[PDB]
Write an enzyme that holds these catalytic residues in place. Structure first.
Site, PDB file in Angstrom:
ATOM      1  CG  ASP A  95      81.121  -7.974 -53.331  1.00 48.94           C
ATOM      2  OD1 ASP A  95      81.529  -6.805 -53.156  1.00 48.94           O
ATOM      3  OD2 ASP A  95      80.783  -8.394 -54.463  1.00 48.94           O
ATOM      4  CD  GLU A 180      70.570  -2.787 -62.556  1.00 49.56           C
ATOM      5  OE1 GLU A 180      71.757  -2.965 -62.904  1.00 49.56           O
ATOM      6  OE2 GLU A 180      70.179  -1.793 -61.888  1.00 49.56           O
ATOM      7  CB  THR A 336      68.132   2.738 -60.286  1.00 49.68           C
ATOM      8  OG1 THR A 336      68.820   3.032 -59.096  1.00 49.68           O
ATOM      9  CG2 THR A 336      69.094   2.798 -61.446  1.00 49.68           C
ATOM     10  CD  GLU A 374      65.292  -0.919 -57.126  1.00 48.60           C
ATOM     11  OE1 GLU A 374      64.614  -1.980 -57.312  1.00 48.60           O
ATOM     12  OE2 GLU A 374      66.552  -0.859 -57.210  1.00 48.60           O
ATOM     13  CG  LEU A 377      74.986   5.193 -55.223  1.00 51.03           C
ATOM     14  CD1 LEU A 377      76.009   6.288 -55.507  1.00 51.03           C
ATOM     15  CD2 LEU A 377      75.675   3.830 -55.209  1.00 51.03           C
TER      16      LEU A 377
HETATM   17  O1  LIG Z   1      68.407  -6.423 -53.802  1.00 48.26           O
HETATM   18  C1  LIG Z   1      68.065  -6.052 -55.131  1.00 48.26           C
HETATM   19  C2  LIG Z   1      69.333  -5.972 -55.963  1.00 48.26           C
HETATM   20  O2  LIG Z   1      70.193  -4.989 -55.366  1.00 48.26           O
HETATM   21  C3  LIG Z   1      71.473  -4.794 -55.997  1.00 48.26           C
HETATM   22  O3  LIG Z   1      71.375  -4.195 -57.306  1.00 48.26           O
HETATM   23  C4  LIG Z   1      70.893  -2.828 -57.319  1.00 48.26           C
HETATM   24  C5  LIG Z   1      72.047  -1.817 -57.199  1.00 48.26           C
HETATM   25  F1  LIG Z   1      72.624  -1.839 -55.950  1.00 48.26           F
HETATM   26  C6  LIG Z   1      71.569  -0.385 -57.454  1.00 48.26           C
HETATM   27  O4  LIG Z   1      72.693   0.511 -57.430  1.00 48.26           O
HETATM   28  C7  LIG Z   1      70.809  -0.285 -58.782  1.00 48.26           C
HETATM   29  O5  LIG Z   1      71.672  -0.552 -59.888  1.00 48.26           O
HETATM   30  O6  LIG Z   1      69.716  -1.210 -58.761  1.00 48.26           O
HETATM   31  C8  LIG Z   1      70.080  -2.594 -58.607  1.00 48.26           C
HETATM   32  C9  LIG Z   1      68.802  -3.439 -58.676  1.00 48.26           C
HETATM   33  O7  LIG Z   1      67.960  -3.251 -57.521  1.00 48.26           O
HETATM   34  C10 LIG Z   1      72.220  -6.125 -56.068  1.00 48.26           C
HETATM   35  O8  LIG Z   1      73.507  -5.957 -56.684  1.00 48.26           O
HETATM   36  C11 LIG Z   1      71.367  -7.126 -56.845  1.00 48.26           C
HETATM   37  O9  LIG Z   1      72.110  -8.325 -56.980  1.00 48.26           O
HETATM   38  C12 LIG Z   1      70.033  -7.336 -56.136  1.00 48.26           C
HETATM   39  O10 LIG Z   1      69.211  -8.181 -56.942  1.00 48.26           O
END
Ligand SMILES: OC[C@H]1O[C@H](O[C@H]2[C@H](F)[C@@H](O)[C@@H](O)O[C@@H]2CO)[C@H](O)[C@@H](O)[C@@H]1O
Ligand SMILES: [Cl-]
Length: 485
Positions: A95, A180, A336, A374, A377
């Site tokens: 990461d 989430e 999402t 949103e 991916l």
């Molecule tokens: O930057 C917002 C948020 O982005 C990520 O989480 C997202 C996932 F990538 C996506 O696949 C889907 O599950 O929606 C998530 C929420 O936007 C980061 O991992 C997260 O930490 C960050 O807050």
């Protein structure tokens, strides 16, 4: 035609503010945001990281980097959606951006490890505090809910200019891992890999005690968590709990699934009540994020949804219950998977992102909520954009007025140089045109009223009336009527 316009937001980089809480990307972002403005974009979204801002100690809020970022966004003329990000960014091997929750909060954990969601092998997930400690005053005199409320209050006070100038229009309240509202039931660091069913993460001592009390209150004090549930990477048919006609259907199974999913609903309700009190009178909407657990949606136990905390079955609407809880707050759902087609998924995964999207959107709309989405991916291709378009306006353009249903907004994951160069940029700009129903950007679309107080608290029994009868979703067109090209 204007009633068809769907706003487009772009998610900023995860390190828009550095991991040391300094604003270092001024020049880069200024050029990138000009490209977004030139492409018609309505606003951007940004994680406001608890670990950066309250990193040095209790109530030592350092907003200075976020203020510079926000001034930049305001000067570009963009709207802003701020995420109250009470979770860890990254932290897995490989990461790029690692931002834990505050060190002083983790320090409490070295003495009380039960502040973390805990699995059946006792592994502590450090990415978020268990809903079990929402009202436990463990953190130098404060409960988790008080910390969230105080953070939001400090945000409001420090960003008051941006709120008053109409720059900040949306507050997304983080309610779990990745922001989430869910349990951390599929963690890469604990060895989960797609499409494992995941695990119930309710073993912290606070939640164990909560369950014992809840069980005794229905005359079954002996009862315990199910133990026929397999492990992270199992498939449903390898477990007695999740298999067809398995023990998820028993009286005991039902009680446990309701207890687990209800606790998440109560966690969201109580935190949103505080958020609403904080932002009362400001022209903002509050939102939560619901994760898109599309894997195992095609089998009767919906196993991966269940372990995430979404108690969704063919005859039980585990998203409409959540939407019913959000109603009194006039909070929006941010979902999402807006970009996914079922044909794009692995068959072994038993995955139905299209049907899940239709279910969640239809749940929100039936409760009178604004619903936004949103992409799950990264995608830069026309097909993805066309899929989002379909979801944005499920019944197409209405010539006469507004459509019967539409998304309130769509947020694109995520900004980088790759998006604002080459054919990517051309595809994206054309997407924004289509989202806007080919009209120019209107910065004054979807004005917000001063946030009113949440309506009367309703009981869990009241909320759960929404679970049944489970309704078919609204029909969605197979393909958008306004494709990119
Ligand atoms: O930057 C917002 C948020 O982005 C990520 O989480 C997202 C996932 F990538 C996506 O696949 C889907 O599950 O929606 C998530 C929420 O936007 C980061 O991992 C997260 O930490 C960050 O807050
Ligand atoms: Cl109904």
């Amino acid at each position: 035609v204007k009633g068809n316009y769907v706003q487009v937001y772009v998610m900023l980089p995860l390190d828009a503010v550095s991991v040391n809480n300094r604003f270092e990307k001024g020049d880069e972002l200024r050029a990138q945001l000009r490209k977004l403005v030139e492409a018609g974009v309505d606003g951007v979204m940004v994680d406001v990281w608890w670990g950066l801002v309250e990193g040095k100690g209790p109530k030592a809020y350092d907003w200075s980097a976020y203020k510079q970022l926000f001034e930049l966004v305001q000067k570009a003329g963009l709207k802003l959606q701020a995420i109250m990000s009470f979770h860890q960014c990254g932290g897995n091997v490989g990461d790029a951006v690692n931002i834990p929750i505050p060190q002083w909060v983790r320090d409490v954990g070295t003495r009380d490890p039960d502040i973390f969601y805990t699995d059946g092998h006792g592994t502590r997930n450090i990415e978020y505090l268990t809903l079990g400690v929402d009202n436990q005053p463990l953190f130098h005199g404060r409960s988790a809910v008080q910390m969230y409320a105080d953070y939001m209050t400090s945000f409001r006070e420090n960003m008051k200019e941006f709120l008053d100038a109409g720059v900040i229009v949306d507050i997304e309240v983080g309610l779990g891992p990745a922001g989430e509202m869910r349990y951390p039931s599929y963690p890469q660091s604990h060895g989960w890999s797609f499409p494992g069913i995941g695990e119930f993460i309710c073993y912290d001592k606070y939640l164990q005690a909560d369950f014992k009390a809840a069980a005794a209150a229905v005359g079954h004090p002996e009862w315990e968590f199910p133990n026929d549930v397999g492990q992270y990477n199992d498939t449903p048919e390898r477990t007695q709990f999740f298999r067809d006609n398995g023990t998820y259907l028993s009286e005991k199974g039902r009680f446990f699934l309701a207890w687990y999913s209800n606790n998440l609903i109560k966690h969201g309700d109580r935190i949103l009540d505080e958020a609403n009190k904080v932002f009362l009178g400001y022209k903002v909407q509050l939102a939560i994020k619901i994760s898109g657990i599309h894997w195992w949606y095609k089998v009767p136990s919906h196993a991966a949804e269940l372990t995430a905390g979404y108690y969704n079955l063919h005859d039980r609407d585990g998203y409409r219950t959540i939407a019913r809880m959000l109603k009194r707050h006039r909070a929006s759902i941010n979902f999402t998977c807006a970009e996914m087609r079922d044909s794009e998924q692995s068959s072994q995964a038993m995955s139905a992102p299209e049907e899940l999207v239709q279910q969640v959107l239809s749940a929100g709309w039936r409760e009178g909520l604004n619903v936004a989405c949103e992409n799950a991916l990264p995608r830069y291709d026309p097909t993805a954009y066309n899929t989002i378009l379909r979801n944005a306006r499920p019944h197409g353009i209405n010539q006469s007025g507004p459509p019967e249903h539409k998304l309130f907004g769509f947020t694109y994951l995520r900004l980088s140089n790759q998006l604002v160069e080459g054919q990517n940029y051309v595809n994206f700009k054309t997407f924004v045109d289509r989202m806007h129903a080919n009209l120019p950007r209107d910065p004054y679309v979807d004005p917000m009223a001063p946030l009113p107080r949440s309506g009367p608290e309703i009981s869990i029994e009241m909320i759960l009336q929404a679970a049944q009868p489970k309704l078919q979703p609204f029909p969605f067109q197979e393909h958008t009527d306004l494709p990119v090209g």
